[PDB]
């Protein structure tokens, strides 16, 4: 076919059939002229090579093309492989009525709906807009409808809001491993150019918002709309197919807002006062008379399913906090009060959603997950939970333990220069005493973080769990655990060289202190090995998924 410029693109099959036709005509011409036997045996071998290069090139000396060193592409090259018709154009096709843009948060959504830009919604839904405009008579013909949606007149946006209203789109992130990678939503139109994606859904996608971009597809026909609503709407998939655990688990800001909201310090405003219910708990917190967390007797009324699907009510004075009572308005009718009477980390809130689904069905769990996300973001904003440089307390017992270990390695050094030990038992003793020093540093820094807040009420003193920022961000299960908190406050581990052997001189400096050049240079190897392993394990996990689905 002609490219622009008078120069053509041929497929290499034209070369192959040209070579086969050429040598066939040559062999007919030779058998006309009664050639000697060496020549026709040469020509029959050549015709064998030409046909065998046409059917599957690569099982011979790889007959290359003209004006190029690159080997050409035969028929079995077009069937077989990553670029064959079986895997590039039959099992997966590029599809119209699709779009692609950068994703972002937008926490003001219920989870049956996602944001979608006006410009993408105009470009995707063009034939729908054409149909409604020629139905409503604003465009006499369809070319007028083209020019009306081209000029973007003010009448088409009401039309587009009519064609969106109950029409689910499909959102898709590119590593679509498990079946929650394609989910439907109902679009809310956005002044902007970025798809707003509901936050609780993102843990299903393995989508962080660090620049990853997603794709929307549009169910055209009516059965596909009903499939995307009945089977693939986001409110249907709140349980994983891998296990019965919730996949719409609240992820990071919301669990921090909860863990700040439901806790108790021994002295706060309104300590030990009495409250008639959750409503004046909210009136006390939002007026500023009583604090968010202070232990308080309240009166709450919990319902239960004691009889056959019947909501038996019991009311009592529970001894709780203020913030727990404020969260109690959001719990539906069926659940007992003991689901909000603890500290509510990430495990506890997953158990909360699991019990709400296994009791009240689907609808209160969906609207309950939306209300949890809203109140988590709101009281995380009211928390002001902020990391800082004073938030990482270094133990006073750090350098003392490091000096003791530095004397003990000198002891083992003198015991090896005295010829008393061999090399391997020396090595094992030194690595055991550095691991012992690291464990003492860990048990020093944990007791210097978690109970460091000591304050007073109607007496001398009392200790409690700490309101350190990084301790809340590690205890809530929002981000990271005590391994990374250990690598920020105490010494970081014992690094391993490219042998897989492990160095006798560990990194006795955290990140709050500086690292000098040699320690950081040793740490770089572990970082680069980690990155290379994540890439290679991604590839092998893809291959394992493909074999497992194609066997089953």
């Amino acid at each position: 076919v002609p490219l622009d410029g008078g120069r053509f693109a041929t497929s290499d099959l034209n070369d192959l059939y040209r070579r086969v036709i050429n040598r066939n005509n040559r062999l007919k011409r030779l058998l006309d002229l009664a050639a000697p036997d060496i020549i026709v045996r040469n020509e029959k071998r050549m015709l064998q090579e030409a046909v065998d290069a046409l059917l599957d090139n690569g099982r011979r000396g790889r007959a290359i093309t003209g004006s190029n060193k690159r080997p050409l592409k035969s028929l079995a090259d077009m069937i077989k492989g990553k670029q064959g018709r079986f895997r590039q154009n039959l099992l997966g096709k590029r599809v119209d009525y699709s779009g692609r843009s950068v994703i972002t948060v937008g926490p003001y959504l219920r989870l049956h709906q996602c944001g979608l830009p006006k410009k993408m919604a105009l470009e995707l839904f063009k034939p729908f807009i054409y149909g409604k405009l020629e139905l409503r008579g604003l465009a006499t013909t369809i070319k007028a409808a083209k020019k009306m949606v081209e000029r973007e007149e003010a009448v088409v946006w009401d039309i587009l809001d009519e064609v969106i209203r109950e029409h689910p789109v499909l959102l898709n992130r590119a590593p679509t491993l498990h079946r929650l990678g394609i989910q439907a939503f109902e679009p809310v139109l956005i002044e902007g150019k970025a798809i707003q994606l509901h936050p609780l859904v993102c843990a299903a996608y393995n989508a962080d918002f660090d620049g990853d971009q997603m794709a929307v597809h549009v169910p055209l026909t009516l059965e596909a709309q009903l499939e995307a609503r009945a089977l693939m709407m986001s409110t249907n998939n709140i349980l994983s197919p891998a296990n019965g655990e919730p996949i719409i688990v609240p992820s990071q800001d919301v669990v921090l807002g909860l863990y700040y909201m439901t806790r108790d310090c021994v002295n706060a405003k309104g300590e030990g006062m009495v409250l008639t219910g959750p409503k004046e708990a909210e009136r006390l917190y939002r007026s500023g008379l009583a604090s968010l967390h202070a232990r308080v007797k309240v009166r709450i009324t919990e319902y239960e399913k004691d009889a056959n699907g019947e909501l038996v009510a019991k009311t009592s004075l529970k001894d709780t906090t203020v913030g727990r009572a404020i969260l109690w308005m959001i719990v539906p009718k069926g659940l007992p009060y003991s689901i909000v009477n603890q500290a509510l980390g990430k495990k506890a809130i997953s158990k909360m959603l699991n019990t709400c689904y296994r009791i009240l069905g689907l609808k209160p769990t969906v609207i309950f997950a939306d209300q949890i996300m809203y109140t988590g973001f709101a009281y995380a904003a009211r928390s002001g939970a902020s990391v800082g440089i004073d938030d990482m307390v270094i133990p006073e017992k750090k350098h003392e333990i490091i000096s003791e270990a530095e004397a003990e390695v000198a002891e083992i050094q003198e015991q090896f220069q005295s010829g008393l030990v061999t090399a391997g038992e020396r090595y094992n003793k030194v690595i055991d005493i550095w691991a012992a020093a690291n464990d003492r540093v860990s048990k020093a820094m944990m007791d210097n973080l978690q109970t460091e807040t000591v304050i007073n009420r109607d007496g001398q003193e009392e200790k409690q769990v700490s309101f350190n920022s990084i301790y809340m961000m590690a205890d809530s299960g929002a981000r990271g655990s005590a391994a990374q908190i250990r690598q920020l406050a105490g010494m970081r581990g014992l690094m391993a060289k490219p042998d897989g052997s492990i160095i006798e001189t560990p990194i006795t400096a955290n990140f709050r202190e500086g690292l000098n050049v040699l320690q950081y240079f040793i740490s770089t190897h572990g970082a680069r090995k980690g990155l290379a392993d994540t890439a290679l394990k991604t590839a092998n996990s893809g291959y394992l998924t493909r074999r497992l689905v194609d066997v089953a």
């Binding site: 076919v1 693109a9 690159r70 054409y130 369809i142 070319k143 083209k146």
Partner: protein, 52 residues
Amino acid sequence: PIGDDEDSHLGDFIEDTTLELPLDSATTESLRAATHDVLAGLTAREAKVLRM
């Protein structure tokens, strides 16, 4: 191959110019409908001659 040696070869970029756009098919359908409605409005001989 175009650059970076991906599965992107030159063949995946060549557009088809022998198809007709589907909007032109929509115009042709609506034009046949409109002309049929207009030729219904004529007489018998005029519509028959103009179709023939």
